[PDB]
């Protein structure tokens, strides 16, 4: 029918989760530096 709004929402969540994890630990890496 059209754009995978449902799929692009899913990979948006995935994208957001990766960042929270990566940036969150990237932070903690420097704080213990």
């Amino acid at each position: 029918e059209e754009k995978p709004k449902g799929a692009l929402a899913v990979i948006l969540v995935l994208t957001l989760t990766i960042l929270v994890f990566w940036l969150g630990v990237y932070a903690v890496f420097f704080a213990r530096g």
């Binding site: 799929a7 990979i11 995935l14 994890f21």
Partner: protein
């Protein structure tokens, strides 16, 4: 001497069942220690209770050795050998060399038992990584070797099928499932060489007495050569089912054949040359080479990222076909009554926080935050113990009937759904618990319930680990109950044991041909993968083999 006509024109069916049964028994036995380990990380010592139940168990670590081995190694390899031999055979409708296929099962069975003896007798409490100088009983190493080599027969078996099919269909593109199977087994062959060399050159002569030293650095380098790809060797058999059967169970179609093929092609390429991401905390390995390996590991995440889109779209598509609504309607349209659908879907959810955890660990310097903490077990239970096992569990709902002819009652179906939800939920809670404490520096592979006051700051996550331990204990029991209910009933319909495997339709396009055709150049791609391994490992291995420093063995249990 044959009681069921089924097993005489599809005798692979029988050989497949044996691989599956042996694999789920090992899963059960290994899984028993799980709950106790979970309570251990909830600061609760339930082991004197376990010791009273199982009187051969000597320590936490003997338990943990059995847990890793029987769940991560045995269950997973036997599931792979089942899936990645049977599914291609049925897609092609070709019989696999049955002489060799039974030989591979016996190898697995004799290898398991041989290695099981010293493990059960506390002569090989060295965990599933068996790092030197920790020195086990020879029969563990011999047992493991034979067990692993069984796969080399499997590789041959599939290659053979593939050659034969290429013969009957000249110039045709390798069908999907078979293609995955081929690049899977080829990948596994290239991967296995790191563990074989370790065994042949060091561990086997060492345990037998031939030599008295083994260099730990080169021992764990070769290990991790195989050490990482083996996780994909656990994963891809689930991926094959997720790509080619799940869409059907959902009520839709695989939206792309070439994407699937590209996903699997990349894995064959990047699965092996990435072991150093396990050795970031090792000395004697050049930091540049670690950054190199950290980049390739970021790349090996790509296949999974692709997979995430391809599968999501295929489940949105399926949902719409079921009468999908808006942005989230297709979700509710799916067959949530079907365990063969639910189980892998849930595994995929938890795979999201699992993958991100992986990418973090893969960021060279950021590993030092989490390395060897409770975070790592947190990471992989979302991966192996969730996605893989769940996919495995749910897949019994179509695979068990198809091999045996035994139908599944509505009751067993709903029993499954409970077991699946609980297993998932329980793995989720545990995940939170282990990640949390891992950030709070709680080590892994530790009997921390024996040192109560050692980690007071982990107060609240230790609750989660208790909870999960209870939750997953119940889920396990119900699994055993439900599994044995299905394996011990004499209800048999021989017609659904002759029913085809619910393979999904493949949406194909115009652009496909040219891309699919270049991907079918397997002989080329196999050499490419081979060269990458030489380039990534060669320079380091040669520097480590010129400066060997073997150290004597220790038994510390």
């Amino acid at each position: 001497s044959e009681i069921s006509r089924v097993y005489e024109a599809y005798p692979e069916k029988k050989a497949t069942l044996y691989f599956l049964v042996l694999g789920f028994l090992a899963l059960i036995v290994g899984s028993l220690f799980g709950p106790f380990q979970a309570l251990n990380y909830g600061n609760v010592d339930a082991y004197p209770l376990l010791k009273r139940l199982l009187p051969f168990v000597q320590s936490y670590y003997q338990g943990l050795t059995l847990h890793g081995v029987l769940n991560a190694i045995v269950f997973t390899q036997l599931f792979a050998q089942a899936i990645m031999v049977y599914l291609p055979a049925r897609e092609l409708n070709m019989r696999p060399n049955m002489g060799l296929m039974w030989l591979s099962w016996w190898m697995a069975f004799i290898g398991l038992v041989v290695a099981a003896l010293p493990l059960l007798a506390n002569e090989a409490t060295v965990l599933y990584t068996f790092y030197p100088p920790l020195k086990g009983h020879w029969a563990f190493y011999l047992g493991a070797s034979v067990f692993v080599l069984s796969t080399w027969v499997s590789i041959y078996i599939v290659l053979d099928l593939w050659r034969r099919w290429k013969a009957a269909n000249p110039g045709k593109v390798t069908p999907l499932v078979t293609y995955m199977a081929v690049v899977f087994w080829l990948m596994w062959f290239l991967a296995s060489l790191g563990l074989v060399l370790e065994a042949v050159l060091f561990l086997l002569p060492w345990s037998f007495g031939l030599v008295e030293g083994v260099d730990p650095l080169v021992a764990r380098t070769l290990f991790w050569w195989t050490g990482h790809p083996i996780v994909y060797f656990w994963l891809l058999p689930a991926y094959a089912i997720i790509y080619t059967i799940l869409p059907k169970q959902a009520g839709g179609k695989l939206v792309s054949d070439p994407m699937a093929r590209l996903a699997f092609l990349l894995f064959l390429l990047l699965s092996t040359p990435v072991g150093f991401h396990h050795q970031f905390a090792d000395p004697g390995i050049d930091p540049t080479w670690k950054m190199i390996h950290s980049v390739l590991t970021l790349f090996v995440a790509v296949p999974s990222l692709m997979t995430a889109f391809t599968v999501a779209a295929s489940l949105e598509f399926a949902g719409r076909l079921r009468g999908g609504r808006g942005l989230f309607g297709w979700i509710r349209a799916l067959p949530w009554d079907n365990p063969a659908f639910v189980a892998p879907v849930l595994g995929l959810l938890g795979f999201i926080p699992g993958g991100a955890g992986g990418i973090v660990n893969a960021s060279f310097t950021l590993d030092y935050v989490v390395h060897n903490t409770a975070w790592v077990p947190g990471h992989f239970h979302l991966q192996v113990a969730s996605l893989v096992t769940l996919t495995a569990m749910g897949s019994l709902y179509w695979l068990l009937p198809n091999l045996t002819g035994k139908p599944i009652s509505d009751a067993q179906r709903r029993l499954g759904l409970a077991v699946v939800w609980l297993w998932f939920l329980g793995m989720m809670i545990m995940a939170v618990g282990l990640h949390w404490a891992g950030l709070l520096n709680v080590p892994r592979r530790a009997y921390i319930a024996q040192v109560p006051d050692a980690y007071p700051h982990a107060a609240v996550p230790m609750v989660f680990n208790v909870l999960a331990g209870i939750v997953l204990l119940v889920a396990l029991l119900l699994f055993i109950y439900g599994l044995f209910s299905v394996l011990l009933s004499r209800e048999r319909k021989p017609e659904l044991a002759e029913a085809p495997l619910p393979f999904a339709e493949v949406i194909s396009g115009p652009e496909d041909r040219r891309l699919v055709l270049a991907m079918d150049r397997i002989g080329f791609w196999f050499a490419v993968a081979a060269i990458l391994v030489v380039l990534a490992y060669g320079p380091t291995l040669v520097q480590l083999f010129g400066h060997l420093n073997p150290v004597p063995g220790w038994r510390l249990w």
